[PDB]
Design an enzyme around this catalytic site. Structure first.
Site, PDB file in Angstrom:
ATOM      1  CB  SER A   1      -1.467  -2.109  -8.179  1.00  0.00           C
TER       2      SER A   1
ATOM      3  N   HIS B   1       0.820  -1.206   0.000  1.00  0.00           N
ATOM      4  CA  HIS B   1       0.000   0.000   0.000  1.00  0.00           C
ATOM      5  C   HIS B   1       0.846   1.245   0.000  1.00  0.00           C
TER       6      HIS B   1
ATOM      7  N   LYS C   1     -15.447  -4.562 -10.046  1.00  0.00           N
ATOM      8  CA  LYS C   1     -14.600  -5.540 -10.730  1.00  0.00           C
ATOM      9  C   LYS C   1     -14.353  -6.729  -9.813  1.00  0.00           C
ATOM     10  N   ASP C   2     -13.965  -6.450  -8.579  1.00  0.00           N
ATOM     11  CA  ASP C   2     -13.710  -7.501  -7.604  1.00  0.00           C
ATOM     12  C   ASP C   2     -14.960  -8.359  -7.415  1.00  0.00           C
TER      13      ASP C   2
ATOM     14  N   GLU D   1      -1.066 -33.898  -5.010  1.00  0.00           N
ATOM     15  CA  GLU D   1      -2.044 -33.387  -5.984  1.00  0.00           C
ATOM     16  C   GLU D   1      -1.399 -32.407  -6.960  1.00  0.00           C
TER      17      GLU D   1
HETATM   18  C1  HEM Z   1      -2.327 -16.065   0.540  1.00  0.00           C
HETATM   19  C2  HEM Z   1      -1.966 -15.671  -0.675  1.00  0.00           C
HETATM   20  C3  HEM Z   1      -1.995 -14.214  -1.144  1.00  0.00           C
HETATM   21  C4  HEM Z   1      -2.914 -13.266  -0.937  1.00  0.00           C
HETATM   22  C5  HEM Z   1      -4.144 -13.493  -0.064  1.00  0.00           C
HETATM   23  C6  HEM Z   1      -2.527 -12.048  -1.592  1.00  0.00           C
HETATM   24  C7  HEM Z   1      -3.139 -10.805  -1.684  1.00  0.00           C
HETATM   25  C8  HEM Z   1      -2.863  -9.730  -2.521  1.00  0.00           C
HETATM   26  C9  HEM Z   1      -3.722  -8.631  -2.860  1.00  0.00           C
HETATM   27  C10 HEM Z   1      -5.160  -8.479  -2.335  1.00  0.00           C
HETATM   28  C11 HEM Z   1      -3.054  -7.787  -3.638  1.00  0.00           C
HETATM   29  C12 HEM Z   1      -3.535  -6.520  -4.377  1.00  0.00           C
HETATM   30  C13 HEM Z   1      -4.192  -6.736  -5.751  1.00  0.00           C
HETATM   31  C14 HEM Z   1      -3.400  -7.439  -6.807  1.00  0.00           C
HETATM   32  O1  HEM Z   1      -2.334  -6.899  -7.181  1.00  0.00           O
HETATM   33  O2  HEM Z   1      -3.827  -8.515  -7.279  1.00  0.00           O
HETATM   34  C15 HEM Z   1      -1.769  -8.346  -3.950  1.00  0.00           C
HETATM   35  C16 HEM Z   1      -0.699  -7.905  -4.666  1.00  0.00           C
HETATM   36  C17 HEM Z   1       0.564  -8.459  -4.773  1.00  0.00           C
HETATM   37  N1  HEM Z   1       0.908  -9.732  -4.296  1.00  0.00           N
HETATM   38 FE1  HEM Z   1      -0.274 -11.025  -3.404  1.00  0.00          FE
HETATM   39  N2  HEM Z   1      -1.278 -12.235  -2.138  1.00  0.00           N
HETATM   40  C18 HEM Z   1      -0.978 -13.585  -1.957  1.00  0.00           C
HETATM   41  C19 HEM Z   1       0.107 -14.292  -2.400  1.00  0.00           C
HETATM   42  C20 HEM Z   1       1.162 -13.719  -3.052  1.00  0.00           C
HETATM   43  C21 HEM Z   1       2.290 -14.443  -3.613  1.00  0.00           C
HETATM   44  C22 HEM Z   1       2.368 -15.979  -3.532  1.00  0.00           C
HETATM   45  C23 HEM Z   1       3.095 -13.527  -4.144  1.00  0.00           C
HETATM   46  C24 HEM Z   1       4.442 -13.662  -4.882  1.00  0.00           C
HETATM   47  C25 HEM Z   1       5.384 -14.440  -4.382  1.00  0.00           C
HETATM   48  C26 HEM Z   1       2.483 -12.225  -3.944  1.00  0.00           C
HETATM   49  C27 HEM Z   1       2.977 -11.019  -4.354  1.00  0.00           C
HETATM   50  C28 HEM Z   1       2.231  -9.904  -4.645  1.00  0.00           C
HETATM   51  C29 HEM Z   1       2.720  -8.720  -5.339  1.00  0.00           C
HETATM   52  C30 HEM Z   1       4.173  -8.605  -5.803  1.00  0.00           C
HETATM   53  C31 HEM Z   1       1.698  -7.858  -5.445  1.00  0.00           C
HETATM   54  C32 HEM Z   1       1.740  -6.471  -6.125  1.00  0.00           C
HETATM   55  C33 HEM Z   1       1.646  -6.422  -7.658  1.00  0.00           C
HETATM   56  C34 HEM Z   1       1.166  -5.129  -8.273  1.00  0.00           C
HETATM   57  O3  HEM Z   1      -0.048  -4.861  -8.000  1.00  0.00           O
HETATM   58  O4  HEM Z   1       1.943  -4.407  -8.964  1.00  0.00           O
HETATM   59  N3  HEM Z   1       1.270 -12.385  -3.348  1.00  0.00           N
HETATM   60  N4  HEM Z   1      -1.648  -9.517  -3.124  1.00  0.00           N
END
Ligand code: HEM
Ligand code: HEC
Ligand code: HEM
Lengths: 62, 241, 106, 43, 131, 78, 379, 64
Positions: free
Chosen positions: G205, G201, G227-228, G271
């Protein structure tokens, strides 16, 4: 002139959110019943006589 | 490392998304299990709850479940003085306990049919093609008597006595008891004991599918209206330069 | 000893630039840069004209991306017009920081 | 408590009842699906 | 062609598809050969660009034709009727349609290439002598 | 710490937008969609086309070969 | 301010990261996986708590318990199958999430990418333990083979595998432990997700174009909340389509057989979400070499930020990397295929090449392609 | 009764005839050179498949 169906609907039910939600509550009710009814019937049709509902006769009251 | 033959997508009333179970099949099959199969294979998670699921009444199944508790009754469960009546009792275990069960079949352990359909890879097709599949040992092959040859068993050999044979049993109505006709009915009753909820679930799926289309379409419209403003806007640059 | 190679090298370059979304988008190679600390300071050093321009082109770009539409064939960025306007600025910034790093050795 | 009470406030209350009144109806509808009164079903 | 001929039926789709790819590649080299011969490319690199074009295109057409044909054979499991090739025939044009980036030529190529292939299969079935 | 008044500096850009209730969610969707969807897909397919082709080809070969070894052994030795 | 509900309560202000926040305009559909990822965690959680409202964690019962949840309990059948199918979704969604930051340079946010990585590997452990709870043939043997894979460590390993199991095999001891850890990992995970969102935040993004969008920023509430919601709509669609029409389809394992410790499915395999790792592990002859290689498959992720060579954090404007990017996904798909394959010549030789092609694509090919592209642009 | 007829039919089709030749040679090769490690099982495995595909579709319209 008259209001399009929607404009009529609008001014009666959707200006005030109080009425809007009232609507929705009502709607959710009415909808559930027809969906089911219609949706159920559809499903039973596709398995005519395959389901107990169809088959209860055989061993029922003699 | 022996090729394993695989089950046809045998024509089933239920193969289809909206298709449902055929209880009369269930019914028939049930008796097949009960007369042909109760003897060595158990169904632990199946109670005497066919009622609505199998169109047996509550009086009908009560009765049906009463005699099974009179002969096999809770004396095999540990209810010393138990007899006819009860409905919460589950289908009667062929033998006191698994070890015995292998002795009666000589080392082999009659799998609980409860979940066979969903357990073993390949569903009802396999189950149907196993029972209905029994052919002549292949030139130059040897077979210990228990080791009957079956065209569809992984290791190309099963310890299974004549599963089902023509005129094994008789159904109430008069359904022609063919080896196969019976197996069609037996499998179906198994499908159900494996996934009783699924048959009911399929109807929900049809409703869900109908619900999803109305919902999927509606959601898109809402998204467009909400996202409409972003697409509509005009951007331009106007420096005095 | 690059005569044929240079021309060949030049030929390869036009295809990549034309091929790249940046040419289609209408944002010059310099606007596609990963905004990092050095780029950031070079950006800040841009003239109102240069600078405001980058803001509009990225504005128009991110607008197209949002709508999934490409700009008209007539209005595209042509490789022959490689404004490397950031380059100048960007160079120094790095130049200055390399120096600083080097001055810190001992 | 005392501060909240006022001669002037009444229009808001009247307005609230409709929205509130509309809101009240929704709960009955919401409760009813879960409640499944045979009488409610009969209605 | 004798290699490609021993399909058998449609079993092992890859084994077949490689052969069709081979035939398509051959015809591509021939067409490229006369094209270079009769349309002097000027600057030889452009010439190999040309031959790369045709060769890759015809090879692609042969590949996709072969595998769609055998897959249809191994899926419909009819598997002997001429229509079994025709889809691939229809498919082939689309491949040709893709490289040319034109709906028109792709559309025509679908129909005629399809009918030609269908006639070929029909011919294998009927021992038509051509020569 | 403020995300809206502090993002960046923008001069000389005019933007024109219209209200949701004045427009349609989709304007010429069938006509607009076919072109853009078709145009975007071709470019996308090409870039990602190579990864897809290799996987399909390898899967077919692997299934066949593994099955093939398992399928015949008696004929080879006698 | 007065009566601005939002900033009045301090707590309610904290929630205006949903409503008021700067959101990029342009923004592929891919982003909807973050939100969806969190819907999946919440879904799993409610489901889990209702399943764990009627489950038991003992050798004897477990099987039965699950079996009882799917038969006599009211709407426990869907709850359970929703549960099982959910986790597939949860993973499908996670791998879209990682792909999008592998492609678009979102991983530039070092801090946020290291929390992601932690997230991904936490969710991996939860899914590994939850699949064994039922105590079915597949589960039983899968936890033996994986855990024992840890006994490749030379000095400790051996002792350590026995600590984890709480005995010499996998009896009760081990099955209650998994129940406890499965239940408490998703609650720890939720705090990490919120720590993840925290960092993210601070910089907002990224986009397709790869360029700052501060010049074109949209209110999250108006636009993104719909959208969400829409993305949920589709998400649930897939969940229910799966769970209502083909319950088992995506749950490869047919082993609804109570575990018998002498018995073995010759075809033992995790799996779908784990296959990649599996295949990469079998490619190595040596046990220890495999385990390290297994780890690196997944742990390799944190190294990408250092590996980035280009000047355009966006792959969008770079062909060659787009081409290798896709291959690696299709290589990944190739490796998942090997996972359900007999471990014989045909698959062996394939897997091995795949395993090298994966590491090449990540460790050597892409990096070079990055440079090249930069030099073609004259950068 | 039902099953047994339909099986036969199925093996009466030109592709069943054709691939049963491998079974016939199999059986004899193996029975005569009995000591061999040759499996006649593996040969049978192709026949069975083709018989059964067929069986299924037809055999189903015959039951109750
Ligand atoms: C429990 C699993 C996860 C949840 C609940 C979660 C949640 C979120 C949410 C709500 C956002 C903001 C919207 C979006 O960009 O899609 C986001 C962004 C991001 N997440 Fe995840 N995340 C998860 C797993 C991961 C993993 C596995 C990675 C990478 C190793 C990761 C890296 C990122 C990054 C780098 C962003 C920012 C990208 C951008 O918007 O430019 N997240 N995450
Ligand atoms: C002897 C009493 C007996 C009866 C009656 C019987 N079976 Fe079995 N069945 C066995 C035994 C013993 C095995 C173990 C096979 C083995 O280990 O080779 C077995 C195995 C099976 C299998 C093999 C699955 C596998 O891969 O392990 C299936 C399916 C099966 N039974 C279903 C049925 C059905 C359905 C019926 C009713 C029509 C039935 N059986 C009737 C004794 C019986
Ligand atoms: C996102 C994190 C989670 C993931 C990936 C996950 C996944 C799983 C999986 C894959 C299984 C095996 C089910 C089967 O195939 O039969 C399972 C079972 C189970 N999980 Fe979860 N789960 C998660 C969170 C939770 C939570 C939060 C709870 C409780 C609060 C929980 C409780 C259970 C229980 C009690 C079972 C056993 C009953 C059954 O087999 O369904 N899980 N979980």
């Amino acid at each position: 002139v008259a209001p399009t169906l929607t404009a009529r609907l609008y001014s009666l039910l959707f200006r005030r959110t109080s009425t809007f939600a009232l609507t929705i509550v009502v709607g959710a009710l009415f909808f559930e019943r027809a969906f089911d009814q219609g949706a159920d019937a559809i499903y039973e049709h596709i398995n005519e006589g395959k389901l107990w509902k169809h088959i209860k006769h055989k061993y029922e009251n003699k | 490392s022996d090729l394993e033959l695989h089950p046809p997508s045998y024509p089933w009333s239920h193969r289809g998304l909206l298709s449902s179970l055929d209880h009369t099949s269930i019914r028939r099959g049930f008796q097949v299990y009960k007369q042909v199969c109760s003897s060595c294979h158990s169904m632990d998670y199946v109670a005497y709850r066919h009622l609505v699921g199998v169109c047996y009444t509550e009086d009908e199944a009560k009765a049906l479940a009463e005699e099974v508790e009179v002969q096999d009754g809770p004396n095999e469960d540990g209810e010393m003085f138990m007899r006819p009546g009860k409905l919460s009792d589950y289908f009667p275990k062929p033998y006191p306990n698994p070890e015995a069960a292998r002795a009666a079949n000589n080392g082999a352990l009659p799998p609980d049919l409860s979940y066979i359909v969903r357990a073993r890879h390949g569903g009802e097709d396999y189950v149907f093609s196993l029972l209905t599949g029994y052919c002549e040992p292949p030139t130059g092959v040897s077979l210990r008597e228990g080791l009957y040859f079956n065209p569809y068993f992984p290791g190309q050999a099963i310890g299974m006595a004549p599963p089902i044979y023509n005129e094994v049993l008789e159904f109430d109505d008069g359904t022609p008891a063919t080896m196969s006709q019976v197996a069609k009915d037996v499998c179906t009753f198994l499908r159900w004991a494996a996934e009783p909820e699924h048959d009911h679930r399929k109807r929900m799926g049809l409703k869900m599918l109908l619900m999803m289309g109305l919902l999927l379409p509606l959601v898109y419209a809402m998204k467009r209206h909400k996202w409409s403003v972003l697409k509509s806007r005009k951007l331009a640059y106007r420096p005095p330069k | 000893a690059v005569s044929a190679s240079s021309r060949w090298l030049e030929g390869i370059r036009k295809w990549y630039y034309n091929a790249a979304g940046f040419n289609k988008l209408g944002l010059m190679r310099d606007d596609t840069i990963h905004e990092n600390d050095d780029v950031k300071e070079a950006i800040r050093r841009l003239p109102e004209n240069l600078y405001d321009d980058r803001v509009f082109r990225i504005k128009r770009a991110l607008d197209l991306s949002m709508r999934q539409q490409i700009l008209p064939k007539e209005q595209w960025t042509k490789y022959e017009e490689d404004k490397s306007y950031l380059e100048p600025y960007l160079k120094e910034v790095i130049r200055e920081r390399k120096e600083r790093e080097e001055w810190a050795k001992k | 408590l005392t501060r909240f009470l006022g001669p002037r406030y009444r229009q808001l209350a009247r307005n609230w009842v409709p929205t509130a009144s509309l809101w009240g109806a929704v709960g009955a509808v919401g409760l009813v699906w879960a409640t499944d009164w045979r009488l409610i079903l009969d209605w | 062609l004798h290699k490609y001929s021993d399909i058998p039926e449609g079993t092992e789709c890859h084994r077949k598809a490689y052969a069709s790819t081979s035939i398509g590649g051959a015809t591509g080299l021939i067409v490229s050969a006369y094209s270079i011969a009769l349309k002097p490319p000027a600057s030889f690199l452009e010439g190999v660009a040309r031959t790369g074009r045709y060769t890759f295109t015809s090879a692609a057409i042969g590949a996709i034709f072969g595998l769609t044909s055998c897959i249809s054979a191994q899926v419909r499991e009819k598997p002997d009727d001429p229509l079994n090739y025709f889809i691939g025939g229809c498919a082939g044009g689309l491949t040709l349609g893709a490289r040319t980036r034109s709906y028109g030529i792709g559309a025509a190529a679908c129909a005629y290439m399809g009918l030609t292939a269908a006639l070929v299969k029909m011919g294998q079935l009927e021992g038509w002598q051509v020569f | 710490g403020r995300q809206f008044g502090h993002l960046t500096r923008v001069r000389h850009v005019i933007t024109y937008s219209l209200s949701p209730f004045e427009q349609r969610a989709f304007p010429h969707y069938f006509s607009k969609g076919i072109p853009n969807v078709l145009r975007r897909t071709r470019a996308c397919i090409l870039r990602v086309a190579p990864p897809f082709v290799a996987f399909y080809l390898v899967y077919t070969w692997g299934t066949q070969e593994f099955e093939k070894s398992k399928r015949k052994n008696p004929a080879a030795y006698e | 301010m007065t009566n601005i509900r939002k900033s009045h309560p301090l707590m309610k202000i904290v929630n205006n990261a949903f409503i008021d926040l700067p959101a990029p305009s342009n923004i592929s559909s891919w982003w909807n996986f973050g939100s969806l990822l969190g819907i999946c965690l919440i879904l799993q959680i409610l489901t889990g708590l209702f399943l764990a409202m009627h489950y038991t964690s003992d050798t004897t019962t477990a099987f039965s318990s699950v079996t009882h949840i799917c038969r006599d309990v009211n709407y426990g059948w869907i709850i359970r199958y929703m549960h099982a199918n959910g986790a597939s979704m949860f993973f499908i969604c996670l791998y879209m999430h990682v792909g999008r930051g592998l492609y678009y340079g979102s991983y530039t946010f070092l801090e946020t990418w290291n929390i992601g990585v932690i997230l991904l590997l936490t969710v991996m452990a939860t899914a590994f333990m939850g699949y064994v709870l039922p105590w079915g043939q597949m589960s039983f043997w899968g936890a033996t083979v994986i855990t024992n894979l840890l006994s490749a460590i030379p000095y400790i390993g051996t002792n350590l595998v026995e600590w984890i199991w709480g005995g010499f095999s996998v009896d009760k001891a081990t099955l209650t432990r998994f129940f406890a850890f499965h239940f408490i990992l998703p609650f720890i995970i939720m705090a990490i997700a919120m720590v993840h969102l925290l960092f993210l935040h601070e910089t907002g993004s990224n986009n397709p174009t790869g360029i700052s969008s501060d010049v074109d920023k949209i209110p999250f509430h108006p636009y993104y909340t719909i959208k969400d919601i829409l993305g949920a709509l589709l998400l649930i669609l897939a969940l229910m389509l799966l769970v209502l029409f083909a319950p088992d389809l995506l749950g490869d394992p047919d082993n609804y057989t109570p575990a018998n410790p002498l018995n073995t499915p010759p075809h033992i395999k995790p799996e779908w979400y784990f296959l990649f790792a599996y295949a990469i592990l079998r490619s190595i002859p040596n046990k220890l070499g495999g385990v390290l290689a297994l780890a690196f498959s997944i742990l390799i992720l944190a190294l990408i930020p250092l590996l980035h060579t280009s000047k355009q954090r966006s792959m969008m404007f770079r062909p060659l990397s787009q081409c290798l990017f896709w291959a690696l996904v299709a290589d990944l798909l190739t490796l998942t295929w090997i996972g359900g394959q007999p471990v014989e010549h045909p698959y062996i030789t394939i897997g091995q090449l795949a395993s090298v092609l994966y590491f090449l694509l990540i460790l050597v090919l892409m990096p070079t392609a990055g440079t090249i592209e930069n030099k073609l642009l004259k950068w | 009764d039902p099953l047994t007829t339909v099986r036969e039919q199925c093996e009466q089709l030109e592709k069943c005839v054709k691939a049963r030749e491998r079974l016939e040679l199999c059986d004899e090769r193996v029975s005569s050179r009995s000591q061999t490690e040759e499996d006649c099982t593996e040969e049978l495995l192709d026949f069975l498949h083709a018989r059964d595909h067929c069986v299924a579709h037809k055999l189903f319209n015959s039951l109750k």
